[PDB]
Design a protein around this ligand. Structure first.
Ligand SMILES: O=c1ccn([C@@H]2O[C@H](COP(=O)(O)OP(=O)(O)O)[C@@H](O)[C@H]2O)c(=O)[nH]1
Length: 447
């Protein structure tokens, strides 16, 4: 192959997934693929015989800052600022030796990194290597981020109570959404600033989205980011099953085959989300009160003070519920049994659900999640946002609204229609197809 692309993921599930979907889409367009990855949280390389992996940054000589960090929880993510602050020299050496050791008929066209690797911009620049960025969060989230200076001056960033009102200058959000999203503003201000700055300075931004999903946000991206933006809905191309870091339960499909069509609520609150025991029990009570069948992925550590789901009484989630640890999520969402998805509103999950035409119930645990929940619930109207905590009646009502009630037909139909828009976008002539054609041509032009 004439042209090689190097991709550099953030080594967590929500970041490795999109970047290896992208790598596949690019391989299909005729690029060879090298993945630069930490040893930490590496995917299964035997799932990718067509890719070359090069492991970097935490190899066994290994700096003292990255040694001793836990492999899971919230502290595992301290690898990100550490690598941003200390990885530049090594990333440069690794890139250069690959650029030099390439064939006569082969060239390295570009580096694609996660947006959180803001340090890679200065490194790629120093090699005259073009860096493109993969955003793993939505265009709307970005639009909210660049509106922070106006939120600050309106005094929405102070923990003042105008919580239920539309935000002035940003009518799609309520003040509470902004409060929730930017609950650690003063803390994360500097690092978020760096990610934005270096994304703006990149050679192109690939968004895991499609035009017809976030059409209100496209002008912001054209205005605020001088580099070209490309929108590709990765889950429409292929699922992320090959980049799973955990063993799929898979016995779920036998259970799903015993369920009537559209009768199952899929429930998953996210990789690092945490609840008090009180709220965990309130969620379970909500699920039982809904009377719907459910498949609930609970990650160990979801319930504060418990290893897994110990506070649940025996048989409390009777015949119609199943709790598992891990599934091939998009494949589950594609299964005919699934009627809805109660999500924490992480962007991959949200987008997978959209691409599978599954309507949603939204909870959030901050960051971009309340913004995704607000946009999907109030703008697209493909789900119901439980935006006032956890209360069994409200939960049960939301589940039933989406899965059963005639009054929620609009939500179900909107989800079907939005899937169709995603499918159309991929076909020759569609917005994503053309965005991908432009990306391929753009990358091929960079030399
Ligand atoms: O049981 C599971 C739960 C999650 N996922 C995948 O893990 C990723 C989670 O990303 P997301 O952005 O939704 O949120 P995070 O969990 O990173 O907060 C998605 O691609 C899901 O499809 C999965 O394959 N199986």
């Amino acid at each position: 192959r004439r042209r090689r692309i190097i991709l550099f993921p953030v080594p967590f599930q929500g970041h490795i997934n999109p970047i290896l979907q992208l790598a596949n889409v690019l391989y299909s367009k005729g690029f060879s693929i090298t993945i630069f990855h930490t040893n930490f949280n590496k995917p299964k390389t035997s799932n990718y015989p067509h890719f070359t992996f090069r492991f970097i940054l935490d190899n066994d000589p290994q700096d003292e800052r990255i040694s001793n960090l836990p492999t899971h929880g919230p502290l595992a993510g301290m690898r990100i600022p550490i690598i941003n602050e200390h990885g530049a020299d090594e990333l440069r050496r690794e890139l250069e030796l690959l650029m030099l050791a390439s064939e006569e008929d082969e060239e390295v066209s570009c580096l694609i990194t996660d947006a959180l690797w803001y340090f890679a911009q200065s490194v790629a620049d120093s090699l005259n290597l073009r860096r493109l960025v993969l955003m793993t969060s939505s265009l709307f989230n970005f639009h909210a981020h660049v509106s922070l200076p106006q939120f600050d001056e309106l005094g929405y960033l102070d923990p003042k109570t105008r919580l239920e009102e539309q935000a002035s200058g940003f009518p799609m959000l309520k003040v509470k959404d902004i409060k929730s999203a930017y609950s650690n503003w003063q803390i994360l201000k500097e690092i978020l600033g760096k990610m934005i700055k270096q994304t703006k300075a990149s050679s192109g931004v690939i968004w895991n989205s499609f035009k017809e999903l976030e059409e209100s946000e496209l002008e912001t991206v054209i205005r605020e980011i001088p580099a070209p933006s490309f929108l590709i809905p990765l889950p429409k191309h292929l699922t992320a099953s090959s980049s799973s870091l955990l063993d799929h339960d898979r016995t779920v499909f036998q259970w799903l085959d015993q369920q009537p069509p559209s009768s199952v609520l899929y429930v998953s609150f996210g990789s690092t989300s945490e609840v008090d025991e009180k709220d965990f029990l309130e969620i379970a009570r909500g699920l039982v009160d809904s009377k719907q069948s459910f498949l609930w992925v609970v990650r160990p550590g979801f319930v504060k003070g418990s290893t897994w789901v110990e506070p649940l009484p025996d048989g409390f989630l009777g015949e119609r519920g199943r709790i598992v640890k891990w599934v091939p999520q998009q494949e589950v969402l594609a299964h005919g049994a699934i009627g809805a998805f109660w999500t924490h509103s992480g962007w991959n999950s949200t987008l997978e659900s959209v691409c599978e035409g599954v309507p949603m119930i939204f909870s959030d645990f901050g960051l971009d999640q309340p913004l995704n929940a607000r946009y999907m619930s109030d703008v697209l109207k493909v789900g119901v946002y439980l935006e006032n905590g956890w209360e069994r009646g409200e939960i049960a009502n939301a589940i039933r609204r989406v899965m059963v009630d005639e009054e929620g037909e609009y939500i179900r139909q909107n989800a079907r229609v939005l899937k169709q828009k995603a499918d159309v976008s991929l076909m020759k002539g569609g917005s994503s197809y053309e965005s991908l054609e432009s990306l391929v041509s753009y990358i091929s032009s960079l030399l």
